[PDB]
């Protein structure tokens, strides 16, 4: 779920509040992005969006609150490494993997504070 | 067209008024849906949406009123079956199948009054 | 960018103001469209959208103002012929081609004065 | 229903796409009729509007989809003429006549393209 | 006034909270008209609007808060029956009758739960 | 026309600027209408609105700018008395008469300054 | 309810229309206000708000339309004197008192014609 | 946090999706409520609001994301009983207690589906 | 008044322009705040807001321009101290303290550039 | 006034309905202004606007309804020639002259129908 | 600053609350000046507006809070007269004169309460 | 055009992304004026607006897309200097100069980071 993704970011990027840094960044980080990513971080978010889009169509993703925002999956953060532990519910597993890949993608990307709260009318 | 779609539902589901049962059901049945389906029926509607999405991009679909909402196709309902009788117009034939498939999917799926008039804010 | 795109059209269709003939044409011309294209011209605009969609995902396209709307590419118009000059900047080459392809398409397709300033509520 | 109305227009007026010539003409043709008719054609649309208004207060009209826009009646177009064949359902018969009368009024009236795409703020 | 009207309904139909059963029923109940009444109950509401329409035209009705919504009239509910006690003020009498007639009409008409929270888009 | 009605008011009520007193008065004077009139003057405007509604339906009324707002008629104000002079154009004559009886009605009605810019939501 | 409140004021201040004198007065009169009261009258309206605030929290106030705006209480006005008659329904007694107290306050306080239709942007 | 409150409700009320039942109920359950509670459940939500309001002012509640919506506290749900385990962070403890009291309050209150998605204009 | 408040900040904090440092800091500094403070400085602003809230309800605060935003009090800044010299006007004396207290709290508290121009969506 | 300017245009340009051709033309003709004129006609309107801006500053111009929109001046249209006749009221004379030179300017400028209802966002 | 402007008004005009007599008079006094002045007083406000417009382009005016609304100048009001005492800061001196000139213009001009709370749609 | 203007700035000031440093600086940079320029940099922007204002008035500027925002001019940036190559088209020359002058002005003026993302509310 939303909070689990936030915690996954804390796992890959210690000491830095994810909501207070990735919530509204560039053209895709945050809520409903469009256009072209302003950098590598932003593209991580663009890809994250696409993954979620895929989850909504996944055969196994069906049911109340089974959406990426509310669906609670099982994962572990051990020594800066994340593992998705779901075996039975493949929807929770797909979702977990979307967040894992993203959190890890965020960790390998330069973060520019100037791109925070970017005017999205420029994202076309 | 949509009126034909409604009548296709009546064919496979005589016991219901399509506009009261599938107008605002789940996250995909009815005007613009998003998020992930709440159940099997909702999924039928999501798939329907996709089919219409494909219909618009189909090469055979061209010209005014060739869209799934208004394009009139030829079909038949005899003993609750539904047969798409278009052959020369591949566009109309495609849209017809979108409707025949969804209509049979609607009947071959459970209905949950609890998901009718669904709170779509719970779809993400 | 779009301003360059307008001039490319002026390069391929000398006799007209792109903003008066192609910005409210059919279902897709002019951006912000959907549904089924009404004719060949309308398809041109649709494949032009798709093209912009791909540009926003091209790996080579990252950075402030790298989007197809505002990204300034290098090109030339000599003897009714358009040439995209970009070379090492693949992103800005791809966009230049999107616009090039559309401008030549607009020119080869018949123009239907009746489809200009099209309703759009009819594109469903 | 509206789609049937369009076809009734094609009957009395073969050389025209109804949705392109009457869906936005004068002050009453098409959607938001208000003010004074610009011409005889425009008046046909005001009458039509009034007829539909009567249709909704006809004691015989009642139930889901019995409105002029969605109610399907039985009619005929043979060698240029229109015949309303409803007998039992007087609600359909009425709606059918609303449409038939407007269709013949459209054909028997002058067409002024200067009045197409009319600036309705001039209707007051 | 409207608050009194709700109580008149509680008078002729004891168990229901008028605001839950008659606020979004069919095309006309709960104010906001258009379309064709879906059933007898819906008729009652359309007739109720008409009544309010006339009230706003009665010579006897003028002055601040003389409208049917806010004009407080004199009436009584005893042993399940409604009595309009206005004599000296014809306007208050007319309005009180509009509400009385409507309350009795609701009580006599069948209540089709399927039509509650009805989608007005289908009233055309 | 608009300016003529204003002058007709100056003819029947010397010493006032019609646009400064009848612009937003009560519930029907000006632009909007709705509810029950707050007094006689307001009722005069209510009746005026209705007369204008009848002119839009008048057979003689049809042509560009032949609406009450812009249609210039022929009238006379001589010694506080108004006379409508049109003989050839019955639409202009009807409009002139709507303005004339309204102006005369205004003159017989007490004007309450407190009703200026009345909160029209209280008009129900 | 508010309509009853208006009549209570008419009971205590015979010579005026509550809606013309107390709905846009100062900073607090008329609901939807804040800041510092401008005079005694304005304080009356403030303590009337506070009173409504307490009513929404009174344990005895629960149920559809139990709020101070729409809850109909029992009361009487005889010889310029207001009496709240409710007895076993404590909620509807408390509200009746809120309105009673305000109406007597309005009457005892000086009325400042200059503070009517007050700016409010000045209430900070 | 938000999700923890949701899970606390599942603890006190097994078999029933909290977001799908309490998210938009009555006048206070959900987001920013006003007026008077429609029943006991609703008041539980009114009180919950007040508790949160208190937390925002609690001396110990200070810091980024230490708000009731995002602040993750420690609690346990064992055999339908909830316990708040925080000892060090008194802000997390206050918040936990707000949710605990509410979840437990919800469990002792009749739930009416008709009050779900209640028109809040009636909450005054 | 607010200009005086600004100058009180300059007194205790010569090294800053109050409008660039405390205009949009945290969740409470500046125009309308909500949620819980991000830090000690933010808390000073929350407390300030409350003080102003009290100022409005103070009995001694009455009349036009007696609000904290525009009410001018008498005070003094000598060697970075700040002394409220009002004695006869208790309202002005109260507001002055609100400002003196917040001003000294601002100086006796840490400043975090990371919380300046804070994303208030993170305040709940 | 408004209607006079319209008639002045009919004087200089017979065979056209000024409100039907100059209402929303280019970027300055009508109501709005902004940007660069699309041609000479548009420039005439741009200049007109400026003349009106000068009249509002004219010393002689002051009094209720003495603005360009409502101020009735004295002029003559004789054989396609316009003459401003005011001598006593210099404000009416100035206004008349703004309308006169504009009407004459319109007559010397080519009228492009394609510029009607121009998308004013392209005017920057 | 504006508060100083108010006091300058109290100087030349002791028997009036500036915020109640000039904050919404005519077409220019107070806030959204546009159109033609209704009277001499109204003109004083248009001039004032123009002066402030000049103040913002004065080369001597620059920096935070140097605008006419927030910039504090030094002035004097003794036995009814106003004296601008700024010498070094020519920006303040200018603003001060803008205010002084308007204040004396207000006093030396007629006051028409009929023009208070003016309907600015009559300004065109 | 604006896109060219951004590049002219990249010419005279290599390291900054113009959109990050000059889009929300002071009161005038980034379009949207009013107030008094805060510093030399802000002056540059105000002067730039003025320039655009004049451009919209140059006799030499007419036709679709001749405005300073979208009018594409001919220029060159070589070895850190800007050259406007327009000769045949004075309008394009004027605009090109407006941008050139501005770019050079930005480069010469001090950049006060504290004024970036400045609150326009303080420009009054």
């Amino acid at each position: 779920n939303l909070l689990q993704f936030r915690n996954m970011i804390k796992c890959t990027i210690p000491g830095r509040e994810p909501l207070l840094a990735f919530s509204n960044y560039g053209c895709y980080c945050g809520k409903g992005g469009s256009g072209t990513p302003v950098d590598e971080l932003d593209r991580c978010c663009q890809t994250h969006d696409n993954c979620y889009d895929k989850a909504e169509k996944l055969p196994e993703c069906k049911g109340i609150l089974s959406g990426p925002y509310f669906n609670t999956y099982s994962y572990d953060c051990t020594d800066g490494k994340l593992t998705c532990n779901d075996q039975n519910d493949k929807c929770k597993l797909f979702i977990c993997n979307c967040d894992r890949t993203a959190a890890m993608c965020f960790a390998k990307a330069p973060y520019n504070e100037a791109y925070n709260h970017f005017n999205r009318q420029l994202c076309k």
Side-chain angles (χ1 to χ4, degrees), chain A residues 62-76:
Chain A
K62 212 205 292 188
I64 311 174
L65 291 180
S66 64
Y69 190 91
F70 302 93
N71 204 173
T72 313
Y73 45 63
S74 78
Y75 78 101
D76 55 2

Side-chain angles (χ1 to χ4, degrees), chain A residues 30-60:
Chain A
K31 301 177 67 182
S34 66
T36 301
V38 302
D39 62 15
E40 204 61 69
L41 211 206
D42 209 7
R43 182 136 260 167
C44 288
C45 293
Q46 179 181 54
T47 303
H48 192 221
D49 282 10
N50 190 51
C51 195
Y52 273 21
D53 279 351
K54 281 180 185 175
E56 307 186 318
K57 304 171 183 173
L58 209 57
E60 296 72 21

Side-chain angles (χ1 to χ4, degrees), chain A residues 66-123:
Chain A
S66 64
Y69 190 91
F70 302 93
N71 204 173
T72 313
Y73 45 63
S74 78
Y75 78 101
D76 55 2
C77 166
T78 295
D79 293 308
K81 185 177 136 186
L82 297 160
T83 308
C84 287
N85 309 313
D86 278 291
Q87 291 187 275
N88 301 324
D89 184 347
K90 291 184 174 173
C91 174
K92 294 182 183 302
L93 183 68
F94 191 80
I95 299 167
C96 182
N97 271 297
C98 288
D99 291 1
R100 173 170 179 287
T101 297
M104 286 176 70
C105 186
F106 290 174
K108 296 195 295 61
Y111 180 78
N112 183 93
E113 294 189 303
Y115 293 167
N116 211 49
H117 294 87
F118 183 66
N119 173 189
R120 293 183 166 179
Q121 301 166 341
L122 306 165
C123 299

